[PDB]
Structure 1
Amino acid sequence: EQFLFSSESVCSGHPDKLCDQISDAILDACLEQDPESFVACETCTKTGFIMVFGEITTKANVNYERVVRETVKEIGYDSEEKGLDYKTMDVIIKLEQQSNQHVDKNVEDIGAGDQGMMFGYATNETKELMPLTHVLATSITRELDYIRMKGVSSRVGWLRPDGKAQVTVEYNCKHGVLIPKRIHTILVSVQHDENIENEEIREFVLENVIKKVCPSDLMDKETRILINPSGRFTIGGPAADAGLTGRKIIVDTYGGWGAHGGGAFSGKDATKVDRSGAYMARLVAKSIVFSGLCSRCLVQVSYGAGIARPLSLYINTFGTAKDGYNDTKLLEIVNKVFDFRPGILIKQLNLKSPIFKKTSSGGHFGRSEKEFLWEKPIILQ
C-alpha cells in the first residue's frame, strides 16, 4: 500500500502567475483607497504587451498602467531578452463598470454574487497542514524567487524570472492517514542568462534550493533529481508562452489533493464567493485537523446567486475521524461555529483589507502571514 503522487509549482515570473499578481496588485490599489470596491480584474500577456480587462466599481483613483508597470518591474521583467520589458511593453486597459444587474439589507442578508462551489482541504502531513508534495514544490519556487528578487548578491545574477518545479513523494496509507515515506523525484526548470551553462545551474539549485528546503531524512541516493532536463531555458516569460489570470488554480490551492470548484482567486474582491468561500472552507478544514478530530479533511460549500445561506455544505474526513466523531457530527459542529453567509464571511476574515497581493504567488494556503486569518485555526470539540 505504497504509492507515488506529484504536485507542482511555478515561479513568480511564470506568465500566468505574472497575470495573477498584476490582477491582485490592482485589487489592492482599489481597496487601499476604497474598501467597498467591486473588482473583477483579469490580466493577459504575450510578447510585448499586457492587457487588464474586466469590471471595477470603485471610488479609488488608481493609475492602473502605473500599477502594471511597477508590478512587472518588481518581478524582474526589465528587458526584451528576458521575455518582457516593463519600460517598453504596451499596457492596454479595458476596464468598465460592473453590470447593473433596492430593499434595505443587514450584513446577514447579503446574497452570494454568483452560484458555485468551493472546497477546503487540510492534512496533518506537514506543520502547515498541507500536502507534502505541494509544500515542497511551492518551497522550491518560493526560494528561487526570494534569492533572485530580494537576495544579496550576484550569487544569482544569471537567474531569470520564469520557472517551474514538480515534486513526487512516495507515500504509505495506514487507515486513511497519509504518511510520506520518501521524496521520489524532484524536477526543477529555471530560466537563465546565455552565459551560464546547465552544469553550474544544477549545482546551484541542488545545494542552495533543493537541499535547503527539502528535509534530508526524506531524500536518499535513489531520489531522482532533474534540473532543466529539456535543455536550455534562456527564452521565457510572455515572449515564449502566453499568460492569463486564473490559469494556476491548482498551484494556488492543494497541488492535486483535495478538490476544486473551478473559480480563480486573483483579481477578485471578497464579495466573489469563489475566493471568500474557498478561504472560509480552508479555515474550517484546517480547524478540524488542528483540533485533532481527524487527520485529513475536505469541505465543500456551494452557493446560489442572490442567496445568503449556502445551498449546501459537505465534510469528508476520509475515514480518519477520531473515536466518537463522524462526518455527520462534524457537520453539525461546523454549523454551530462557522457562518458561510458571504457578508459574515467577509467581516470575519477581514477581507476588505488590501492584503491580496501577497497571496498571488506562493499559494493561498499553508501560509504563515499574520494577515491571513483563514490559516489561524479554531479549536473545535
Structure 2
Amino acid sequence: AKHLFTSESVSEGHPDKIADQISDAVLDAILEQDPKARVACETYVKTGMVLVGGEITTSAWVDIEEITRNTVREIGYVHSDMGFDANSCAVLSAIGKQSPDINQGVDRADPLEQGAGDQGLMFGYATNETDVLMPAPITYAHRLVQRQAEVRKNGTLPWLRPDAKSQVTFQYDDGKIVGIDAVVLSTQHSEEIDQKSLQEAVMEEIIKPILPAEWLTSATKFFINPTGRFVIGGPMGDCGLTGRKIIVDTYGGMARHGGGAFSGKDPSKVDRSAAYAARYVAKNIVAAGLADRCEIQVSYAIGVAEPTSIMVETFGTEKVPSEQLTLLVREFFDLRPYGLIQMLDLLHPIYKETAAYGHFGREHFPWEKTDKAQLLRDAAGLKH
C-alpha cells in the first residue's frame, strides 16, 4: 500500500561534497596528464584548512593548491562571512609518492587478465521509474539542489550562499508515486535576508519550478531552514571528509551500495570501474525491459581477473528466467576490471562533473549509454 520513502541530496556547497569535488578535480587533472595513472586521493575539509593526502602513480606533475582554489572558486566560498575562502584557506598536501616505476617496469601480461586491484564488493542498481533508470526520489533531490546552486550562480537570488541540503519524502502507493509527503530544504543565506522573504523566495524559485505541480499538494509539508540562521555554512559549519557523503552520489539509499567511495579514486581502482560497470549493465538490462528494475552485486578478490561473485536480482520484476539471464550477463560483457574498462573506456578526465549531484542519472556519463540492450533484446525471447 502507501508507504513513505525519503531521499536526500546535498548541494555542491556541502563540505563533504566539497572534498569529493576537490579529490576528483585533482583526479581529472592527473588523468588528463596521464591515461594510465593509478591515483587514490582523499580530501579533508576543515574550517581554516583543507588537506589532501593519498598516493599517485604516474609521470605527471600537478599543482594541487591551484586545483583546489579553482574548485572552491567554482563553488564560491570566497569570503570570510561564508566561513571559508579559496585564497586564504590553508591547502595541505601529503599525496605525492609519484612512483610510476612499479607499473612502468614490465608490461607483458594481458590487461584483461591482470588481477583485480584490491578486494571489494559493489552494486549497480537500475529501474524504470524514470527516464534515466535512476530512482525517482534521489533524482528529484538532485534536481532540487542543482537548481538551488544554479539560482545562486546566475544571481537570481544574489543573497544565496553555496552550502545547502535537501530531503524529500514521497508516498509510494502500489509502487507509483501519488505525491510528495513533505520536502525539507536547508540553505546557506547571506545575513541580509530575513526569514519570511527567504521562505517565500525559496518556495517560489525552487519548489514550484522543479516539482510536478500535481505532486505538490496542500497536505504536502515544507520545512525551510527551520533554524533559518545559516549564514555560517560549509566548513566552519561542519566537518568535511572525502567520500563521507557516499550514499548521496548513489541511488540515495533506494538500493544497496557496496561501500567504496567513488570520488578520489581512478578507474584503476576497482570500486568506480566496477560500479560504473554494474550500473551500465543493469541499465542495458532494464532498457531491454527484462525487469522493471535490477540490482547487481559483484565481488572481486585482490589479484583476480574475474569477479569472485556475480549476483543478479530482479525482485521478481523479471520477464524471463533469472538463470539464462545470468548467462547473458556473463556473456555479453567482459567483467574483468581492465576488461570493463575497455568496454567503457573511462580513461578521460571527466569525473570533475560527476563529483556531485549523483554519479548516475546524467547522459554524458558514458556508462549511462545502453547500446548492448538491443543485443540483449535479441538474446531473450518474448516475456513470460
Q: Same fold (TM over 0.5)?
A: yes
Matches within 5 A, 1:14-33: 14-33=14-33
Provide the rounded CA distance (Å) in 2 between the counterparts of 1:289 and 1:301: 18
Q: Are positions 1:363 and 2:364 aligned together?
A: no
Identity within the alignment, %: 51
Matches within 5 A, 1:85-124: 85-97=85-97, 104-124=108-128
Q: Give the corresponding residue for 1:184.
A: 181
- What one-letter code is carried by the residue in structure 2 that aligns with 1:141? V
The answer as to whether partners of 1:125 and 1:180 remain within 8 angstroms in 2 is no
Q: Give the corresponding residue for 2:240.
A: 243
TM-score (normalizing by structure 2): 0.93
Uncovered stretches (5+) of structure 2, i.e. residues with no partner: none
- What one-letter code is carried by the residue in structure 2 that aligns with 1:354? P
Query: 1:98: how far off?
Result: 7.1
Q: Are positions 1:252 and 2:245 aligned together?
A: no
Q: Give the corresponding residue for 2:208.
A: 211
- What one-letter code is carried by the residue in structure 2 that aligns with 1:90? A
Query: 1:306: how far off?
Result: 0.7
Q: Are positions 1:35 and 2:41 aligned together?
A: no
Provide the rounded CA distance (Å) in 2 between the counterparts of 1:123 and 1:214: 21
SS at match of 1:17: helix
The answer as to whether partners of 1:246 and 1:265 remain within 8 angstroms in 2 is yes
Provide the rounded CA distance (Å) in 2 between the counterparts of 1:169 and 1:11: 20
The answer as to whether partners of 2:58 and 2:98 remain within 8 angstroms in 1 is no
- What one-letter code is carried by the residue in structure 2 that aligns with 1:342? P
Query: 1:96: how far off?
Result: 3.1
Which of the residues 344, 347, 362 maps onto 2:342?
347
Q: Give the corresponding residue for 2:164.
A: 163
Deviations along 1:9-58, one digit per CA (max 9) or x if unpaired, are 00011000000000000000001111111111100111111000000112
Matches within 5 A, 1:1-381: 1-97=1-97, 104-149=108-153, 151=154, 153=155, 155-173=156-174, 178-322=175-319, 325-369=320-364, 372-377=365-370, 378-379=372-373, 380=376, 381=380
Query: 1:97: how far off?
Result: 2.2
The answer as to whether partners of 1:38 and 1:98 remain within 8 angstroms in 2 is no
Provide the rounded CA distance (Å) in 2 between the counterparts of 1:326 and 1:185: 39
- What one-letter code is carried by the residue in structure 1 that aligns with 2:148? L
Deviations along 1:123-161, one digit per CA (max 9) or x if unpaired, are 111111111110111110011112222x1x3x2111111
Provide the rounded CA distance (Å) in 1 between the counterparts of 2:292 and 2:205: 32
Question: In angstroms, what is the RMSD of aligned CA positions?
Answer: 1.4
Provide the rounded CA distance (Å) in 2 between the counterparts of 1:172 and 1:317: 20
Number of paired residues? Answer: 370
- What one-letter code is carried by the residue in structure 1 that aligns with 2:118? D
Note closer, same or farther for the CA distance 1:58–1:103 as it changes in structure 2 (3 Å cut): closer
Provide the rounded CA distance (Å) in 1 between the counterparts of 2:203 and 2:228: 17
Provide the rounded CA distance (Å) in 1 between the counterparts of 2:160 and 2:107: 57
The answer as to whether partners of 1:9 and 1:141 remain within 8 angstroms in 2 is yes
Query: 1:103: how far off?
Result: 7.2
SS at match of 2:235: helix
Provide the rounded CA distance (Å) in 2 between the counterparts of 1:194 and 1:232: 8
The answer as to whether partners of 1:112 and 1:271 remain within 8 angstroms in 2 is no
TM-score (normalizing by structure 1): 0.94
The answer as to whether partners of 2:7 and 2:169 remain within 8 angstroms in 1 is yes
The answer as to whether partners of 1:41 and 1:54 remain within 8 angstroms in 2 is yes
Note closer, same or farther for the CA distance 1:103–1:88 as it changes in structure 2 (3 Å cut): closer
The answer as to whether partners of 2:78 and 2:84 remain within 8 angstroms in 1 is yes
Provide the rounded CA distance (Å) in 2 between the counterparts of 1:92 and 1:374: 33
Note closer, same or farther for the CA distance 1:61–1:130 as it changes in structure 2 (3 Å cut): same
